């Protein structure tokens, strides 16, 4: 399956919100989770390499250390999605102060 079983923003959308105000809430909320996942950082890497996609050819630096690890690749996507979401609200701002992180 895909589903998940076991102090952020309320998970239910408040009562009356414009199509825009709602979009702002959900984006602001993802910005929240993405920041958390990158802080811990709690990535979404599966424990076993069975469900994982085939790995790309490994590339290394001068020390012989691999650069494109699973973790690096996955942390990239999160950083990428977070960036676009942050950038999405750049063409919105109600004078919303950028974090600059």
């Amino acid at each position: 399956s895909r589903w998940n079983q076991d102090p952020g923003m309320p998970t239910v959308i408040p009562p009356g919100l414009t199509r825009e105000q709602e979009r702002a809430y959900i984006v602001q909320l993802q910005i929240e989770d993405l920041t958390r996942k990158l802080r811990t950082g709690d990535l979404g890497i599966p424990p076993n390499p069975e469900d994982r996609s085939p790995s790309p050819e490994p590339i290394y630096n001068s020390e012989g250390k691999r650069l494109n690890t699973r973790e690096f690749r996955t942390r990239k996507k999160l950083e990428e999605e977070r960036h676009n979401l942050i950038t999405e609200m750049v063409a919105l701002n109600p004078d919303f102060k950028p974090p600059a992180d």
């Binding site: 399956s1 895909r2 589903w3 998940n4 079983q5 952020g8 998970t11 239910v12 959308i13 009562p15 009356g16 199509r19 709602e22 959900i26 909320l29 993802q30 989770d33 996942k37 990535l43 979404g44 999605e81």
Partner: protein, 105 residues
């Protein structure tokens, strides 16, 4: 809309990229169905997908029509705050009329 309706909207579950593959799409469908089926007898499901670069409305959202308002209201309470592919599941109610007319939001 104002209050509870018989249509549940799951949000922040998927990104357009995941929906391109037919194999993955069909899977996402039954996963949502089976989970909701625990409160289910659900009437229908709608997961709009590119069709890029049209960017058809409701894309990135998942709609589930329940048979009753009570059922739906119980589905949201249970599903809200959960994870989906490690993503936080956000929820709201949708106007059933809008939904039948395929005006997905």
């Amino acid at each position: 809309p104002l209050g509870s309706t018989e249509v549940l909207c799951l949000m922040n579950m998927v990104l357009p990229e995941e929906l391109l593959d037919d194999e993955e799409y069909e899977e996402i469908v039954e996963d949502v169905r089976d989970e909701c089926s625990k409160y289910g007898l659900v009437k229908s499901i709608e997961i709009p997908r590119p069709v890029d670069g049209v960017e058809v409305p409701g894309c990135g959202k998942i709609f589930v029509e329940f048979t009753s308002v009570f059922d739906c209201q119980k589905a949201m309470q249970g599903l809200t705050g959960r994870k989906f592919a490690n993503r936080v599941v956000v929820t709201k109610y949708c106007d059933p009329d809008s939904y039948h007319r395929r005006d997905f939001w």
